[PDB]
């Protein structure tokens with residue numbers, strides 16, 4: 001039951017109402033329980049190239065399944081929930097660890113205001129002075145302690161999650177104030193110990209293998225049930241402690257982003273109305289993370305590091321059950337942080353809401369009191385049932401992948417990323433936005449295929465499908481679009497450079513975990529997973545329709561070349 005601060009959100013609700021004053025109404029039968037409701041108003045694709053080249057997966061539901069009533073279903077199940085406040089001692093511990101962590105991350109880095117030029121340069125991955133006049137107007141309100149237009153448009157996706165969109169101008173104001181966390185890699189492994197920001201998916205496995213060698217208990221990788229919805233008002237205040245390291249001007253800009261965008265959010269959501277009509281509801285909420293913000297990932301990484309440090313302190317018996325209610329003496333916490341903090345950070349791989357921890361023993365498994373009091377409840381497990389850890393690092397889930405050690409034909413080991421193949425093909429078959437020419441569709445298909453060549457070459461079906469896609473798209477067409485939104489997708493495949501040369505730069509030359517720098521001169525030297533592992537992770541090798549697809553692949557490529565244009569230049573990546 002939300003108690004809104006009308007002094008902070010009132011201006012935004014009035015600005016929305018002024019835009020839709022003639023259809024605005026108050027629906028006393030609205031469905032919101034934990035969100036404050038303010039009023040309502042009246043409101044109003046498959047990648048063909050990848051589909052044609054992945055026929056066996058037309059009947060695989062794990063693939064095709066990936067492509068207002070639905071949006072309300074997600075809101076009700078996932079977002080319309082309230083977690084009790086942690087106890088005072090739990091909150092004192094949270095603030096202490098956050099303050100200590102912020103000071104560690106800022107020891108060799110300084111907060112800075114990000115510029116309009118940096119933002120414009122990123123948008124090329126804004127030209128109208130009127131856009132910047134609206135931005136200036138909102139910034140002036142922010143510097144006076146007001147907010148008129150930083151409103152979320154929350155779109156639900158029932159597959160399930162909510163994406164909280166914001167206008168480009170509000171995203172710039174957030175980037176200007178807090179973009180330094182991303183732009184200057186505050187969560188990079190070197191700066192944070194436990195973070196992995198800036199590492200590609202190609203390096204994450206080696207991190208987990210390094211952690212497997214640190215003496216201790218099992219490796220724990222518990223997923224929080226709906227992380228963003230479990231970010232409390234107290235996590236938000238602890239995250240805001242970075243403002244204490246900012247110069248006065250910068251500080252004013254950030255305190256306004258934190259107050260209005262993070263801690264007193266105004267959101268517009270769609271809802272079905274009578275006879276096919278749709279209404280827009282204006283709702284507000286003080287806690288939770290607004291999924292989609294410029295620093296969502298960085299602040300999720302920060303708070304997850306804080307939570308894992310607290311769990312280790314409880315496991316190691318630094319914190320006791322008396323400390324939840326009130327932390328009487330805090331010296332023990334400061335001592336553990338100053339003495340062991342860095343060792344424990346280096347024992348973690350934290351990427352937003354995903355974590356892997358290598359505690360000093362298995363007491364970590366039953367250290368749940370502080371974790372549960374902070375509302376960071378583990379997914380698919382009884383609240384008080386001890387966590388299950390892993391003995392084999394190659395089976396540890398992290399960033400929706402697991403990592404396996406394979407060997408090149410010359411004997412050198414490599415550590416590769418892997419996930420269930422259905423998710424990979426399913427995502428490649430999704431085309432965002434409609435009306436694309438065969439150029440945009442084929443260029444996005446080519447991006448997916450070259451991404452698989454660099455990272456998932458060890459999957460039989462993907463190496464074959466990637467080669468058929470690359471043989472069906474003109475060689476000179478530059479890959480375009482976004483294959484992934486993950487910060488671990490560094491885009492080395494977004495090029496017309498030969499992918500075997502790119503593979504060598506990523507896996508050999510620039511790979512600090514590849515001692516011998518001898519180049520790999522042929523794709524047949526690059527291994528696949530064993531057939532057992534390829535099948536476990538969704539391969540269709542040996543399955544009749546896939547066998548027919550592979551036997552007919554040259555005919556399928558020729559058909560795609562015929563559609564695109566037989567006069568274009570193609571290369572045979574299959575032979």
Ligand SMILES: [Zn+2]
Pocket residue numbers: 138142146147148149150260
């Ligand atoms: Zn604002």
Ligand SMILES: [Zn+2]
Pocket residue numbers: 402418419420533537
């Ligand atoms: Zn796998």
